[PDB]
Amino acid sequence: MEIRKDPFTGEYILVSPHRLKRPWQPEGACPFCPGAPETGRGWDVLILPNRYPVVTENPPEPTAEDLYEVIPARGSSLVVVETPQHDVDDLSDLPLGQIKKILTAVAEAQRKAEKEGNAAYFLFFRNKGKEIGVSLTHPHSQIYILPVVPPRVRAELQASYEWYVKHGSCLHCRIVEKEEKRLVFQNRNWKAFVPFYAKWPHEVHIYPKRHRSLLTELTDEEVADLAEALKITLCALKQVAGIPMPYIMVLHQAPLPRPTQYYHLHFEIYGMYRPDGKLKHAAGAELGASLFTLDTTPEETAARIKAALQKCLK
């Protein structure tokens, strides 16, 4: 177990071996349902340790090799169990107040991590869909509390700082305020749009209208309007294809625990069906060279998304 580093890309690899279950080994009882000694009862939201953590509190001594940088796999890997119900398809299927509690519980986990003062980064994300390898069907999300900043966020951080120095302001605010044609949804505190620089077949970024760099700075009405943002956007993506779409959601926010004027937090949602509902796989172009292609303009895709989003209201 250790965090290795790629000397050409700077990307980190969370090496944490665990034995892999054989095809004759049952999947076994849902690890996220209430009523087991692990899970307890009477809860709405359960944050618990991942069964196979990629970062741990007292990690083994890192494997070393002369030319390479290795960091101890230190921190927390957690599962946010989003509801006690097993057969709900999606986060978007849950009631607004249930979404609020999930968000509030995540915010609160971040506070704990902030206070504690070690963890460099709080990474919240969600994978959805059998077709992208989500075998555990019970709605859930993930938190990694990390000793390092995620390389992708680290790159966004540098480019953000360098525009703030040059022009005096945050580029994200400037981008959010200007954008309206590619708008998918907005309310008192959040804007959700297909970015100009979209890479995935149905992409939406969700920004707060006010400049927040950290989850923990959100006002209780911000957190509430966020639940509504997430619900309706996710609902739009669940309906646009004609069949529920697999998707990846990540929270991009500043490192722990001090705020920033140049970086502005956002949720990125990569919806992984093309317009015709066949799956889009990240292949040689994407994984091999970080080159993306789109068979359809982002502007046209915001339309389809916004049009399908109309059905969701109710």
Which residues carry a binding-site annotation for Fe(3+)? 156, 252, 266, 268
Q: In the complex, what is the shortest distance from the CB of residue 163 to Fe ion, in angstroms, rounded to a whole number?
A: 14
* Partner in contact with 33, chosen from its own copies, Zn ion, Fe ion, none, beta carbon below 5 to 8 Å by kind: Zn ion
Q: In the complex, what is the shortest distance from the CB of residue 268 to its own copies, in angstroms, rounded to a whole number?
A: 6
141 within 8 A of 92, measured Cβ to Cβ:
no
Residue 49 β-bridge partners: 78
Read off the tokens for 25.
């080994």
205 is catalytic: no
Is 150 a residue that touches its own copies (CB under 8 A)?
Answer: yes
Q: Which of 238, 47, 244, 29 is nearest to 136 (CA)?
A: 29
Q: Which residue ranges make up the annotated binding site for Zn(2+)?
A: 30, 33, 86, 138, 170, 173, 211, 264
Interface residue with Fe ion, options 191, 252, 264, 280 (CB under 5 A): 252
Is 268 a residue that touches its own copies (CB under 8 A)?
Answer: yes
Q: Which residue ranges make up the annotated binding site for UDP?
A: 50-51, 144
Long-range pairs, 52-55, Cβ under 8 A, ≥24? 52/16, 52/18, 53/16, 53/77, 54/14, 54/16, 54/144, 55/3, 55/14, 55/16, 55/144, 55/145, 55/146, 55/147
Read off the tokens for 82.
């989003």
> In terms of CB distance, is 43 or 125 closer to its own copies?
125
Interface positions, 114-173, toward Zn ion (CB under 5 A): 138, 170, 172-173
Euclidean distance between CA atoms 204 and 202, whole angstroms: 7
Q: In the complex, what is the shortest distance from the CB of residue 46 to its own copies, in angstroms, rounded to a whole number?
A: 20
DSSP 3-state assignment of 285?
helix
Q: In the complex, what is the shortest distance from the CB of residue 171 to Zn ion, in angstroms, rounded to a whole number?
A: 8
Residue span 141-160 as binding mask against Fe ion, x where in contact by CB under 5 A, dash where not:
---------------x----
For the annotated catalytic residues, the residue numbers are 140
Q: Give contact residues for Fe ion (rule: CB under 5 A).
A: 156, 252
